Ligand binder design. Sequence first.
Ligand SMILES: *CCS(=O)(=O)[C@@H]1O[C@H](CO)[C@@H](O)[C@H](O)[C@H]1O
Ligand SMILES: *CCS(=O)(=O)[C@@H]1O[C@H](CO)[C@@H](O)[C@H](O)[C@H]1O
Ligand SMILES: *CCS(=O)(=O)[C@@H]1O[C@H](CO)[C@@H](O)[C@H](O)[C@H]1O
Ligand SMILES: *CCS(=O)(=O)[C@@H]1O[C@H](CO)[C@@H](O)[C@H](O)[C@H]1O
Length: 127
Amino acid sequence: KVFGRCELAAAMKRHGLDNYRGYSLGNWVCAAKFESNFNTQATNRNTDGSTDYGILQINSRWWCNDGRTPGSRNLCNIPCSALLSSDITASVNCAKKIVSNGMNAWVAWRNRCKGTDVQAWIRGCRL
Ligand SMILES: *CCS(=O)(=O)[C@@H]1O[C@H](CO)[C@@H](O)[C@H](O)[C@H]1O
Ligand SMILES: *CCS(=O)(=O)[C@@H]1O[C@H](CO)[C@@H](O)[C@H](O)[C@H]1O
Ligand SMILES: *CCS(=O)(=O)[C@@H]1O[C@H](CO)[C@@H](O)[C@H](O)[C@H]1O
Ligand SMILES: *CCS(=O)(=O)[C@@H]1O[C@H](CO)[C@@H](O)[C@H](O)[C@H]1O
């Protein structure tokens, strides 16, 4: 499933991400846009042997368990397969745990969203 900008903003708001730990909804939508292009099925392999899963490109080494990653810590205590769903619940819940060093965890966010008017990503949407 590939979300539309406003469709994802609405879903993330419903899920309580707006202003979670001080991060406005726009930050999360922007992060999703550049991490996965709003694609819930996105999967990308990393050089260290981990994979990044789903809407938020959550990592197998630290966060989720795919059972194929040496040094797996599974800090979100969830199978990575749960992050490849049309239902963003698992990704949202894990994302909350990740930000609890803030959104710098997401390279794409730090590189492209941080410091910009991220509200532009939700402007025009009915929330
Ligand atoms: C992302 C699923 S939902 O139906 O949009 C959303 O899910 C959370 C968690 O189960 C609920 O608390 C929320 O009210 C729902 O809208
Ligand atoms: C899914 C949101 S939460 O973690 O259950 C909820 O988030 C708000 C901020 O948006 C916090 O103030 C609250 O304490 C949390 O439980
Ligand atoms: C928020 C993670 S958890 O599910 O509360 C916690 O996760 C660790 C790591 O996977 C587990 O060892 C622990 O038992 C879980 O409670
Ligand atoms: C978004 C709902 S949650 O994942 O269950 C949420 O997670 C935060 C951080 O782990 C908790 O502080 C909050 O109480 C939970 O509802």
